[PDB]
Design a protein around this ligand. Structure first.
Ligand SMILES: O=P(O)(O)OC[C@H]1O[C@H](O)[C@H](O)[C@@H]1O
Ligand SMILES: O=P(O)(O)OC[C@H]1O[C@H](O)[C@H](O)[C@@H]1O
Ligand SMILES: O=P(O)(O)OC[C@H]1O[C@H](O)[C@H](O)[C@@H]1O
Ligand SMILES: O=P(O)(O)OC[C@H]1O[C@H](O)[C@H](O)[C@@H]1O
Lengths: 308, 308, 308, 308
């Protein structure tokens, strides 16, 4: 280095590029690093958080679809990002979701989170903010491993309450037992007294591409029984119908270690981050059941939700 | 024999050899002796005691304890660092361990880790290595959160396999049940397959400053009775006598989720990083039982370990 | 215009550009606009205020202050490091200047040094650099022992030219005699030919904490009269008022063995390294008089230098 | 590095080489360093002090010559090193003088030193010891620069009092003035209260090879007038004749800033380190004058001294 950590190098290049408008080359020899190191870092900055880009306009998202999704479902916060065929769904939403959370979260506040590419991608772009604002995290469901992608790529000086059990027990009785263990029971309480919550939303229409199945928490065959039973999607493993009600005919619901949906309702602000048109139905059903009262999605999915 | 006796000749060559740095041949003709005679005398020199090379450094004490620990205990690898004599004794324990682990772990191997301050502090310095060499990590016991300050300070793209359950269950039965959940059992098998293991060692003489007791896994009353029943130290919750034998009449043991010390021994290389004179007896017993076969400790402790 | 107005188009391209990282051309056809129209709107974006890039780091403030000091005072090189908010303000001031000196000194060049804690602390980090690049050192004033903590921490095969006399003489006449001894006058000439100069800056408001007074070159009684006479700070024993003018009615000046501030100015690059909010006044004055044209300081001091 | 400083790497190789007898190659791979870096450090160790070689024999030096030099001149300590034609004389003596001082010096004691290659080479071999034993240093004469070869190559945490003036003034008036400045006067007192003293010895017979002249402290022309005026050699600038008496007819003696020979005798142990056959006369004279009561020289000069 040059007596300065990378963080300071990013800020120095960010400053020369944006505030002094210098070619990514002029600043190469200016800071004493290869033309390739320069640009390497610039991108490093945006991805990290050091470099924040502000779009001050009511058109940051899809203004119309937002106003409509807001009224139709009575949502306290809604963000519909511009569509872009063929792209990581969760990676784009994560960006949007991060920004939204950066304005609803107050210093030293509790943030409940659920697994999935959508939320874990948000956690990643939200790492920086969690540090400074000193946000405390707490997992809404069991699983552990399924949370590593998000909390892992974070600072080690942050408070992260992790439910110490699997996401699903082999039997309903074993689930009751673990929920009574002090280590578990403790975090379930912690989770329910959270200020903001961020969860994903799975669809039964996703078949074998649903994070729930490709992670091995539910079998392909069990998925069928669930669809047949009239279920559209899920949240943390709890499945519901197109009207927004938990199908109380599914075996898994009593083997899930982790706050049941009725209990998640206690969190003031509940953000759902999901995209894709095959989710359109499950997302509408989650806003119906009142499981979420804020939503981060993409244009296509917004159109699909509003249409049907 | 230019009027010189052997003793004088020996001192003459020793001076020229070490203080003047002359080749054993340059000294041959300088003293009027055959090149074969000069070398024989130099040899005689050390053999007699006339010539003695002594290492003038604090590190010498460490080197010494390293060989005595290697002789007395059958240790494959040993590393003794300066004691309280120098700054930050605990901090340096992690640096040492981290480097011993770097010379033992090959690209893409499996590393089983234990909880504790020494293990997590070591785990952090080893962040760099773990990423660059694609090391895989697996937790030896339950606890989940107990590992966060270490794996938390790590790369997110790296494989980290954790046991999704408490460190301890409320009863031996609930423990046995948890040990049979596939999501749990999977990681216990993975654990035993590790190539290298890194663990800390707790001491009963540590009283309440003990991490096992400070973290609330064991009550002060339990720790006193454990000490009464002959235990002197512990590794992952399993207590043993100064002989090295796991104490049998201890309830906590069957309530522990995680590999028993016996299985731990299947791992080829087992590194124990522990410092502080109060751990002397326990560390010693840990080796007599064969729980570890590699040790990283500080000068003062080594002294005590070898004393008694 | 796919039904979109300017403001909405700008937000859309801004989103694709920064949050999705698409080429100025890939978003050209995505929005159905000419490749030249795309870039035109992006430009308009920042120029309007709809698009704003802000650096989220503690270092932001520093770069800000570096800019302001640069404009307000004629500074060739400036470095502002975080203040007391961060650990070791004094320690880090040495690191900074050390690096500033490394980008200014070419192999085999002459470096004139002043005494003081900041200068000696800087002179120590720069030990590596001085050797490897064959830097020559020369002292700006008498004191001899006053430099040992710095040059002492250096290689012995390095060229170090020291003034063979006291920092201050008992009378103006003894000083003038000493300044005439060839063995002395020679180091004074060499000092004036240096390429780079590094000095500290004392403040009268430092009272008894001032290095000049702690080292016993000046009595408390003299310091008070000097302040009473308009002096705000000093460099190498020569005092000056807030304007930058060397105070003339001060007796100590004509007793000083060593180059006068005026001669210091012949040195191309003059770097002053000073931290601590109480030197603010003096530092500022040192620049208004042009005794230094490069500055390395802390955030808080910079702030105060700029306030008043 | 391998997590260990160089000091620790030297001790590890010294240990393998001498206490475990392993080829300079087998220890290359053992510490993970180039076969060339191994040997680099090995000899780096001897040079520094970390590797001390002990020669426990009455013949470490030239026994006969020492017993004779001791008795004829009544010396407290005497060391005569083995002769070796064509060699850095001061560099060999330095090793000898070093070891002698290491046994004469008790912790925290003050050592007065004079300039010259002999003393400066001793100071360099003594650096290590001066640090641990925490020996305080003080210059017997002015000069400052002429002492940098020795004190420079030392740690920066040790006490070193330096007479802040030239070795010689341009006039006797100027010389008395300097000897009366508080900072000079003080060090002169510190000098006289020293426990041990180590100085060199110049000989008139050295012509233009005498450090006294090749450093420009005295003109070769002035040298002759001193020779003709009947002087054999000098110590710190003070000239004397074959019998051991200061020629009171020399002008320089009154222009020298620094403890006069008379004052130098106040110091308990006064070791003179000098070699070469052309000094044999000057050295003998200094022992008769009583200036030194200890001597470290080499075999040939020893015989030279005893012959005439
Ligand atoms: O990866 P994603 O599809 O965005 O997330 C879907 C999962 O997270 C949701 O809350 C449901 O529990 C699903 O299992
Ligand atoms: O924090 P430390 O004292 O270094 O670690 C001691 C604990 O970790 C060890 O593996 C044992 O399980 C102890 O309970
Ligand atoms: O120790 P510091 O306060 O940083 O240095 C200030 C002193 O050194 C400066 O050149 C001035 O001569 C002061 O006497
Ligand atoms: O470098 P060396 O010849 O060994 O030292 C000789 C000098 O030091 C002696 O005390 C005399 O003062 C000479 O000036």
């Amino acid at each position: 280095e040059q007596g300065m950590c990378e963080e300071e190098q990013v800020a120095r290049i960010a400053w020369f590029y944006y505030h002094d408008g210098l070619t990514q080359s002029e600043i190469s020899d200016r800071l004493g690093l290869t033309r390739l190191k320069v640009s390497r870092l610039l991108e490093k900055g945006h991805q990290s958080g050091i470099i924040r880009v502000q779009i001050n306009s009511r058109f940051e998202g899809c203004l119309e679809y937002e106003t409509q999704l807001r009224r139709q479902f009575s949502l306290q916060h809604v963000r519909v990002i511009p569509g872009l065929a063929d792209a990581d769904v969760g990676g784009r939403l994560g960006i949007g979701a991060a920004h939204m959370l950066m304005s609803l979260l107050q210093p030293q506040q509790m943030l409940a989170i659920g697994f999935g590419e959508a939320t874990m991608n948000t956690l990643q772009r939200l790492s920086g903010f969690i540090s400074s604002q000193q946000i405390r995290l707490v997992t809404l469901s069991g699983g552990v491993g399924s949370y590593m992608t998000g909390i892992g790529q974070l600072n080690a000086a942050c408070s992260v309450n992790i439910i110490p059990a699997p996401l699903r027990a082999s039997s309903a009785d074993i689930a009751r037992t673990l929920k009574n263990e002090n280590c578990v029971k403790d975090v379930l309480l912690a989770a329910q007294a959270a200020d903001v919550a961020i969860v994903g939303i799975g669809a039964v229409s996703q078949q074998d591409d649903a994070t729930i199945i490709r992670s091995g928490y539910i079998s392909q065959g069990e998925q069928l029984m669930i669809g047949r039973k009239g279920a559209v999607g899920d949240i943390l493993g709890y499945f519901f119908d197109a009207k927004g009600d938990v199908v109380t005919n599914i075996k898994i619901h009593n083997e899930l270690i982790g706050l049941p949906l009725s209990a998640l309702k206690t969190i003031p602000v509940r953000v759902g981050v999901a995209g894709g048109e095959n989710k359109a139905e499950a997302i509408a059903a989650a806003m119906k059941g009142g499981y979420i009262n804020a939503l981060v999605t993409d244009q296509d999915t917004a159109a699909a939700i509003l249409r049907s």
